[PDB]
Design an enzyme around this catalytic site. Structure first.
Site: not given
Ligand SMILES: O=C1c2ccccc2S(=O)(=O)c2cc(-c3nnn[nH]3)ccc21
Ligand SMILES: [Cl-]
Length: 260
Positions: A12, A16-17, A19, A35, A124
């Site tokens: 989805i 930054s790292y 999925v 994550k 970010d």
């Protein structure tokens, strides 16, 4: 794919790292966001988890649990789902209306102001890290490059985040020190520009010239759509290239576009 009580479904988002995958918890019959990380240094992920564990606010995502087996290479962070996803895709030909942007910006302010009080610099801030929840409100996501600090501000030297959104003072190639709260304000300004214009104010496909424009190109407003002068004023103040004079969050809250 089953990881303890969770069933992994489709991707989805991509942060930054790792999925983010939709995951279904069979215990309580509920969808979460997962994550998924693979060890590729690895310290910073546990900095992220520590920061997450400290954050309890309605405009910030909620870490639910971390799954860490020492034998498997993958590490899982479970977040409460924020079901409507990013507030917008950049670039787009259908940006938000001013009233929509104001509504979401107000959430962004309350979250940043909470984060800064908790002594976190997010580093970010951008539209795809601003997730719309069930009630229509924004939640700030992705603390993968955030900084914790002691005292009244952070004193930073590293350059991280998304290029298009990096404040100019974080782009000297002489390793200079810069303060952290003003970095989030800059990114909020690029973000607010994206809300109403559907693209970034400094675009170039060569990274050298993207840095050059961020540091030295005067902010330009497109003829269309024609926005209110007070919204122009606010964006101009947030994208002041000098962090010493750039507007601060307590002033943004009072800005006549914001309280309108
Ligand atoms: O619910 C999420 C979601 C829902 C729909 C679409 C897309 C996302 S999402 O992957 O953008 C995301 C990312 C995180 C996250 N927080 N920190 N790092 N990653 C947490 C939740 C979600
Ligand atoms: Cl974005």
């Amino acid at each position: 794919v089953q990881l303890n009580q969770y069933t992994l479904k489709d991707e989805i988002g991509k942060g930054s790292y790792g999925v983010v995958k939709l995951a279904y918890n069979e215990n309580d019959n509920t969808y979460y966001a997962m994550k998924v990380l693979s060890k590729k240094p690895i310290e910073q992920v546990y900095q992220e988890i520590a920061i997450l564990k400290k954050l309890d606010h309605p405009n910030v995502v909620k870490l639910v649990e971390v799954l860490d087996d020492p034998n498997e290479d993958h590490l899982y962070m479970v977040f409460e789902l924020v079901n409507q996803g990013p507030v917008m895709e950049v670039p787009t030909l259908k940006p938000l209306s001013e009233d929509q942007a104001r509504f979401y910006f107000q959430d962004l302010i309350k979250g940043i102001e909470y984060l800064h009080y908790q002594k976190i610099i997010h580093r970010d801030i951008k539209p795809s890290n601003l997730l719309v929840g069930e009630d229509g409100h924004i939640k700030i996501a992705d603390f993968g490059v955030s900084n914790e600090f002691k005292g009244s501000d952070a004193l930073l030297s590293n350059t991280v985040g998304t290029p298009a959104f990096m404040a100019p003072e974080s782009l000297s190639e002489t390793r200079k020190i810069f303060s952290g709260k003003a970095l989030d304000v800059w990114a909020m300004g690029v973000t607010l520009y994206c809300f109403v214009f559907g693209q970034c104010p400094f675009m170039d496909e060569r990274i050298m010239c993207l840095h050059s424009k961020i540091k030295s190109q005067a902010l330009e407003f497109p003829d269309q759509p024609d926005i209110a002068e007070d919204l122009k004023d606010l964006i101009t103040r947030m994208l002041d290239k000098n962090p010493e004079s750039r507007i601060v969050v307590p002033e943004i809250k009072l800005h006549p576009w914001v309280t309108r």
